[PDB]
């Protein structure tokens, strides 16, 4: 038989192929044009040719547990059967695309996948993805991810401490705002630990709350909160009259300022408790402690 | 392919043919060996035993399949299900070719609805009858990624053709707004503040029941406040029964559900002057003793002060939110101080399901997530209301079949759900049967809805699903399972679909046929790219911080244009509005001489004058 | 100025470093940061500084302390209306945690893409399982046992579920806490204290 | 013969679980059943009807598993 040659599909299960190790075995390298790869590995991609178009399939499980019913009880000391599950289908030449057309049937032959499938696959001529990084198997193909859906959709970074999410996120952000490529980039980070930094040297603004050399000084000036939240970061939150007398003369400050300043839009009929209009805090406290 | 076994409901077959296996080919067509989705035929004298398969390998035992009975036909009649004696050894069993698959997928009612093309053949219709599709129910189960808006407009507007559903009624009830590209001029558009050619949602608040109110307006009062409300209610209800004559209305069955306007506005200032102002004189709280109403601003203290404070001053935070001004500021149900509107519910009603269109979209894209629910318990039970009380006159439900269609239904319909919006639903699908009114449910994440309302649906549209919990929660839905149908799920193309239901003879895994192009539902999302990609321009943030300011989205400030306001104006497609300012008269005047209508455009105006869309 | 400041400023990234203020009141102040950006590019849309004009990424660190299952804070009421709605307004999100078993179920489940790190205990890996919709076994399979670096990209962002190697910062660039040294304070020899002055 | 619902399979007291047999294709929650014993008939009333009556382990082992129904004795009808 030809190279790239695994074995033969023994079962169907319409998303669930079950596949023969054939008699050659003890190899488990199958040579190919210089590299060789190991048969049947967790990881690895299969490709099912059906007369002009292949279907590509992911392997899930290897040995014994992959093998049907009947055959252990006929031999229990025959393993050689690898479980695999479908992904996607390769066109007239056109492109892979995921969702299969046509199963395969019993008899039919199953494929190594070979570098250049894998560029084929993870390859694609859209101009929003960029790379990210390289597959585990070979360094040379790019890992190529979308960004504009990334952005938008959502995003989620979850792994252990020990694995270094850190550096990944980092690596993430800075390949994200490249000025080349993306001069308007535009992320806040809601550092807590203040461990990133050190990342940014010079390519980022870094807010604290006790500036030394050339760090900004975060600032949150009070009268841009709301009524609710206010009391609740002041007052520990409040549920008696005095929320509402708290209220009535942050009211009574609120006119004043508007009549002493002017806003554009602004008068006493289109005025809230929440409107983000200064008030002094001070002169509050005095009169309520005055009084 | 000869069968060799009787097991019941799954016969096995040993094939002697040595190596066929090379797409058989019968009369110039080429059938395959027993595949997947193939159809099985075992002959017995005179009447043909047909079957499915569902499993190829191995796994029956190589020559040996899982087949799986379904039906058989009469004496030439047509597709029965029940056979009359299952096929024993000695007969082989053939294949139902692509004629015979016709036979079998023919229909002779005229109600069935070619809805696609099988992926075997792509001649052979899905004739589906779109009686079982509206009357019993629909459900859309599948990931995202396989194309679900395509497949539902597709179905959507195949059911809408004025030549064949000239008395048709679809209510779409999508979350995103992405359906208004879908059906541009076939469907009414209601947002809460539309642009150009949208109609503007209302909702009366006071034709509402009085637990809705509570709910939504009150808050969830119980105690005392909830006692008072009701007080006021039944005040405000006789007083307007009083001060306006209404047909069928007196003072003698005033019912608390009762759909007549009443002052809230004035209900507001009253519950607001009864417990802020100062009474004059002690000992007395008498009105004169004072020491507007649709205006917000309220004017020895009263002692008729409430404990309902909070909940009032929630009221008159909300009156005042603009998210609300479709709530309690529509244009025409416009309550006066004295409960007086310049139109009624039955305006509404008629905008609402009477339009000359087959298709309306109401979009609730804009509504606050804090009582959504409420508010689609609110619109199904008034459709469900208003076409059940006039359902005896020609114009109800049942003369006119209505489709409600629910996106997202799995946060709203869940396994432990509470809210008003599940009661209706249930409602209606344990009434409509009778009242003619449908239901679909559209979702990506099956396992989370409950498993009889899933149950209670008619037909299903099937699209990939990866994942296997949703595989399982499927399969505890559909009582007509067949292996090979079960499996097939998980490599689904894009655009294809398995359809089993009432709606089809028999169970098509058929392709959604693609809506003809420009009615392609896509949500008007931003590209990250082409908006990152641009170089970076001064910004002017006194404007953003003045609009915030003000609450307001409206600045201050085909090819128009305005020399004396100095504002070329260039219009993109999909009713897309720009005005680029600061642009000299003879820069336009040259583009409008320049090419046609672009690439002057992009090369000079839209990067270096500040725009507005 | 403080909003041109914060995101106008001719830098693309912003970091606030909010190590030094109080813990007590740490998701009410965030809670108010999120509510004032989010207005910001609400009320601005049509302007040329609103979101739908330059999108906007929002990073949140060590997210599992603040969107419990049970959370009262505002942060938590912030970050749902994030999720559910900036998808129109051009405001996205970034949830960076170590303990996925104790972020909301449905917040993690609307997560458009994963980037799932080596994961140890089987809670989390059960819970990262249970909020995933494109599933292979195979790729799965293989969490616990996953190099210093590598990632498993899930999600709507890419073609195929794919693990991948993340390309390292440039030598120079790499995140460190300037946490005290144990061993190298401990390790120097005693000098005499003074402790009027600390007084 | 007619009128057939199915048999008993737990008794717990006064809660008796029943599954409905086969080819059920209807007993509501407010309905009375009968239960005759030799010579005699015990009338109950059904208490719960759905994954309720499922027993903990059925409820994992098949949870869209509804033949199960829960009945509480309420009288008897002697000789």
Same mark, same amino acid.
């Given at each position: 038989?030809?190279?790239?040659?695994?074995?033969?599909?023994?079962?169907?299960?319409?998303?669930?192929?079950?596949?023969?190790?054939?008699?050659?075995?003890?190899?488990?390298?199958?040579?190919?044009?210089?590299?060789?790869?190991?048969?049947?590995?967790?990881?690895?991609?299969?490709?099912?040719?059906?007369?002009?178009?292949?279907?590509?399939?992911?392997?899930?499980?290897?040995?014994?547990?992959?093998?049907?019913?009947?055959?252990?009880?006929?031999?229990?000391?025959?393993?050689?059967?690898?479980?695999?599950?479908?992904?996607?289908?390769?066109?007239?030449?056109?492109?892979?695309?995921?969702?299969?057309?046509?199963?395969?049937?019993?008899?039919?032959?199953?494929?190594?996948?070979?570098?250049?499938?894998?560029?084929?696959?993870?390859?694609?001529?859209?101009?929003?993805?960029?790379?990210?990084?390289?597959?585990?198997?070979?360094?040379?193909?790019?890992?190529?991810?979308?960004?504009?859906?990334?952005?938008?959709?959502?995003?989620?970074?979850?792994?252990?401490?020990?694995?270094?999410?850190?550096?990944?996120?980092?690596?993430?952000?800075?390949?994200?705002?490249?000025?080349?490529?993306?001069?308007?980039?535009?992320?806040?980070?809601?550092?807590?630990?203040?461990?990133?930094?050190?990342?940014?040297?010079?390519?980022?603004?870094?807010?604290?709350?006790?500036?030394?050399?050339?760090?900004?000084?975060?600032?949150?000036?009070?009268?841009?909160?709301?009524?609710?939240?206010?009391?609740?970061?002041?007052?520990?939150?409040?549920?008696?009259?005095?929320?509402?007398?708290?209220?009535?003369?942050?009211?009574?400050?609120?006119?004043?300022?508007?009549?002493?300043?002017?806003?554009?839009?602004?008068?006493?009929?289109?005025?809230?408790?929440?409107?983000?209009?200064?008030?002094?805090?001070?002169?509050?406290?005095?009169?309520?402690?005055?009084? | 392919?000869?069968?060799?076994?009787?097991?019941?409901?799954?016969?096995?077959?040993?094939?002697?043919?040595?190596?066929?296996?090379?797409?058989?080919?019968?009369?110039?067509?080429?059938?395959?060996?027993?595949?997947?989705?193939?159809?099985?035929?075992?002959?017995?004298?005179?009447?043909?035993?047909?079957?499915?398969?569902?499993?190829?390998?191995?796994?029956?035992?190589?020559?040996?399949?899982? $087949?799986?009975? =379904?039906? /058989?036909?009469?004496? %030439? &009649?047509?597709?029965?299900?029940?056979?009359?004696? #299952?096929?024993?050894? *000695?007969?082989? $069993?053939?294949? =139902?070719? /692509?004629?015979?698959? %016709? &036979?079998?997928?023919?229909?002779?009612?005229?109600? #069935?609805?070619?809805? *696609?093309?099988?992926?075997?053949?792509?001649?052979?219709?899905?004739?589906?009858?779109?009686?079982?599709?509206?009357?019993?129910?629909?459900?859309?189960? *599948?990931?995202?990624?396989?194309?679900?808006?395509?497949?539902?407009?597709?179905?959507?507007?195949?059911?809408?053709?004025?030549?064949?559903?000239?008395?048709?009624?679809?209510?779409?009830?999508?979350?995103?707004?992405?359906?208004?590209?879908?059906?541009?001029?076939?469907?009414?558009?209601?947002?809460?503040?539309?642009?150009?050619?949208?109609?503007?949602?209302?909702?009366?608040?006071?034709?509402?029941?009085?637990?809705?109110?509570?709910?939504?307006?009150?808050?969830?009062?119980?105690?005392?406040?909830?006692?008072?409300?009701?007080?006021?209610?039944?005040?405000?209800?006789?007083?307007?029964?009083?001060?306006?004559?209404?047909?069928?209305?007196?003072?003698?069955?005033?019912?608390?559900?009762?759909?007549?306007?009443?002052?809230?506005?004035?209900?507001?200032?009253?519950?607001?002057?009864?417990?802020?102002?100062?009474?004059?004189?002690?000992?007395?709280?008498?009105?004169?003793?004072?020491?507007?109403?649709?205006?917000?601003?309220?004017?020895?203290?009263?002692?008729?002060?409430?404990?309902?404070?909070?909940?009032?001053?929630?009221?008159?935070?909300?009156?005042?939110?603009?998210?609300?001004?479709?709530?309690?500021?529509?244009?025409?149900?416009?309550?006066?101080?004295?409960?007086?509107?310049?139109?009624?519910?039955?305006?509404?009603?008629?905008?609402?399901?009477?339009?000359?269109?087959?298709?309306?979209?109401?979009?609730?894209?804009?509504?606050?997530?804090?009582?959504?629910?409420?508010?689609?318990?609110?619109?199904?039970?008034?459709?469900?209301?208003?076409?059940?009380?006039?359902?005896?006159?020609?114009?109800?439900?049942?003369?006119?079949?209505?489709?409600?269609?629910?996106?997202?239904?799995?946060?709203?319909?869940?396994?432990?759900?509470?809210?008003?919006?599940?009661?209706?639903?249930?409602?209606?699908?344990?009434?409509?049967?009778?009242?003619?009114?449908?239901?679909?449910?559209?979702?990506?994440?099956?396992?989370?809805?409950?498993?009889?309302?899933?149950?209670?649906?008619?037909?299903?549209?099937?699209?990939?699903?990866?994942?296997?919990?949703?595989?399982?929660?499927?399969?505890?839905?559909?009582?007509?399972?067949?292996?090979?149908?079960?499996?097939?799920?998980?490599?689904?193309?894009?655009?294809?679909?398995?359809?089993?239901?009432?709606?089809?003879?028999?169970?098509?895994?058929?392709?959604?046929?693609?809506?003809?192009?420009?009615?392609?539902?896509?949500?008007?999302?931003?590209?990250?790219?082409?908006?990152?990609?641009?170089?970076?321009?001064?910004?002017?943030?006194?404007?953003?911080?003045?609009?915030?300011?003000?609450?307001?989205?409206?600045?201050?400030?085909?090819?128009?244009?305005?020399?004396?306001?100095?504002?070329?104006?260039?219009?993109?497609?999909?009713?897309?509005?720009?005005?680029?300012?600061?642009?000299?008269?003879?820069?336009?005047?040259?583009?409008?001489?320049?090419?046609?209508?672009?690439?002057?455009?992009?090369?000079?105006?839209?990067?270096?004058?500040?725009?507005?869309?």
């Amino acid at each position: 038989e030809a190279s790239t040659y695994i074995g033969t599909v023994q079962d169907v299960n319409g998303a669930n192929i079950r596949v023969v190790l054939d008699i050659n075995t003890i190899s488990s390298l199958k040579f190919v044009d210089g590299q060789g790869y190991r048969i049947g590995q967790i990881g690895s991609f299969v490709r099912i040719p059906i007369g002009y178009i292949n279907l590509f399939g992911i392997v899930s499980q290897v040995g014994a547990g992959a093998v049907p019913d009947k055959l252990l009880e006929v031999e229990p000391y025959g393993h050689r059967w690898i479980s695999v599950q479908l992904v996607g289908e390769e066109g007239i030449k056109k492109e892979f695309e995921r969702g299969v057309s046509q199963y395969p049937t019993i008899g039919d032959k199953v494929h190594i996948v070979t570098e250049p499938d894998l560029k084929k696959i993870y390859g694609t001529q859209n101009k929003k993805y960029i790379s990210l990084g390289n597959i585990a198997s070979v360094d040379s193909i790019p890992a190529l991810v979308n960004i504009d859906t990334l952005v938008t959709r959502h995003s989620a970074v979850l792994g252990s401490t020990g694995s270094g999410k850190s550096t990944t996120v980092t690596s993430i952000l800075q390949r994200i705002s490249d000025m080349s490529q993306f001069p308007s980039a535009r992320i806040i980070v809601f550092d807590i630990h203040g461990e990133y930094a050190a990342a940014f040297k010079g390519k980022a603004k870094v807010y604290k709350v006790t500036p030394s050399n050339n760090e900004l000084k975060l600032s949150i000036p009070y009268w841009a909160l709301t009524c609710d939240e206010f009391l609740s970061v002041a007052f520990g939150g409040l549920e008696g009259s005095g929320r509402n007398a708290l209220i009535d003369k942050i009211y009574e400050l609120k006119l004043q300022t508007l009549k002493r300043q002017e806003y554009e839009g602004i008068n006493e009929d289109s005025l809230t408790v929440d409107t983000p209009i200064p008030f002094s805090i001070h002169k509050l406290w005095f009169d309520l402690y005055r009084a | 392919g000869t069968v060799q076994d009787v097991n019941g409901a799954n016969i096995r077959v040993v094939l002697d043919i040595n190596t066929i296996s090379s797409l058989k080919f019968v009369d110039g067509q080429g059938y395959r060996i027993g595949q997947i989705g193939s159809f099985v035929r075992i002959p017995i004298g005179y009447i043909n035993l047909f079957g499915i398969v569902s499993q190829v390998g191995a796994g029956a035992v190589h020559r040996w399949i899982s $087949v799986q009975l =379904v039906g /058989e036909e009469g004496i %030439k &009649k047509e597709f029965e299900r029940g056979v009359s004696q #299952y096929p024993t050894i *000695g007969d082989k $069993v053939h294949i =139902v070719t /692509e004629p015979d698959l %016709k &036979k079998i997928y023919g229909t002779q009612n005229k109600k #069935y609805i070619s809805l *696609g093309n099988i992926a075997s053949v792509d001649s052979i219709p899905a004739l589906v009858n779109i009686d079982t599709l509206v009357t019993r129910h629909s459900a859309v189960l *599948g990931s995202t990624g396989s194309g679900k808006s395509t497949t539902v407009t597709s179905i959507l507007q195949r059911i809408s053709d004025m030549s064949q559903f000239p008395s048709a009624r679809i209510i779409v009830f999508d979350i995103h707004g992405e359906y208004a590209a879908a059906f541009k001029g076939k469907a009414k558009v209601y947002k809460v503040t539309p642009s150009n050619n949208e109609l503007k949602l209302s909702i009366p608040y006071w034709a509402l029941t009085c637990d809705e109110f509570l709910s939504v307006a009150f808050g969830g009062l119980e105690g005392s406040g909830r006692n008072a409300l009701i007080d006021k209610i039944y005040e405000l209800k006789l007083q307007t029964l009083k001060r306006q004559e209404y047909e069928g209305i007196n003072e003698d069955s005033l019912t608390v559900d009762t759909p007549i306007p009443f002052s809230i506005h004035k209900l507001w200032f009253d519950l607001y002057r009864a417990e802020i102002s100062t009474h004059y004189v002690q000992g007395s709280h008498s009105e004169e003793n004072e020491a507007d109403s649709l205006k917000v601003v309220p004017p020895y203290l009263s002692n008729r002060g409430k404990n309902i404070r909070k909940p009032l001053e929630g009221l008159a935070s909300l009156l005042k939110d603009p998210r609300y001004e479709f709530l309690f500021n529509a244009d025409d149900w416009s309550v006066n101080l004295d409960g007086k509107t310049n139109k009624d519910l039955d305006a509404l009603l008629e905008t609402w399901v009477g339009s000359e269109e087959s298709i309306s979209i109401f979009d609730l894209s804009g509504m606050p997530s804090s009582i959504l629910d409420t508010l689609i318990g609110i619109l199904i039970r008034i459709l469900y209301d208003s076409l059940f009380w006039s359902r005896n006159q020609p114009e109800g439900g049942r003369e006119r079949p209505l489709l409600v269609v629910l996106e997202e239904a799995h946060t709203y319909l869940g396994k432990d759900s509470r809210g008003i919006a599940i009661d209706g639903v249930r409602k209606i699908v344990k009434e409509g049967r009778k009242y003619g009114i449908g239901m679909m449910l559209v979702s990506q994440r099956p396992s989370e809805i409950d498993s009889t309302i899933l149950s209670q649906c008619g037909t299903l549209f099937a699209l990939r699903m990866n994942n296997s919990s949703d595989r399982n929660h499927v399969l505890g839905a559909v009582s007509d399972s067949f292996e090979g149908l079960m499996g097939m799920l998980p490599t689904l193309r894009t655009g294809e679909a398995i359809i089993i239901g009432e709606s089809v003879r028999l169970p098509m895994r058929t392709i959604i046929s693609p809506p003809p192009f420009g009615r392609r539902p896509d949500s008007l999302d931003p590209d990250v790219t082409a908006k990152w990609s641009n170089n970076r321009v001064q910004g002017d943030y006194k404007e953003v911080l003045t609009l915030w300011r003000q609450k307001k989205v409206r600045s201050q400030r085909s090819i128009g244009y305005e020399a004396d306001s100095m504002t070329l104006e260039i219009e993109f497609n999909h009713g897309l509005v720009y005005q680029y300012y600061d642009v000299p008269e003879t820069l336009h005047t040259e583009l409008l001489a320049a090419e046609s209508h672009g690439k002057f455009f992009n090369s000079q105006i839209k990067n270096n004058y500040r725009f507005s869309r």
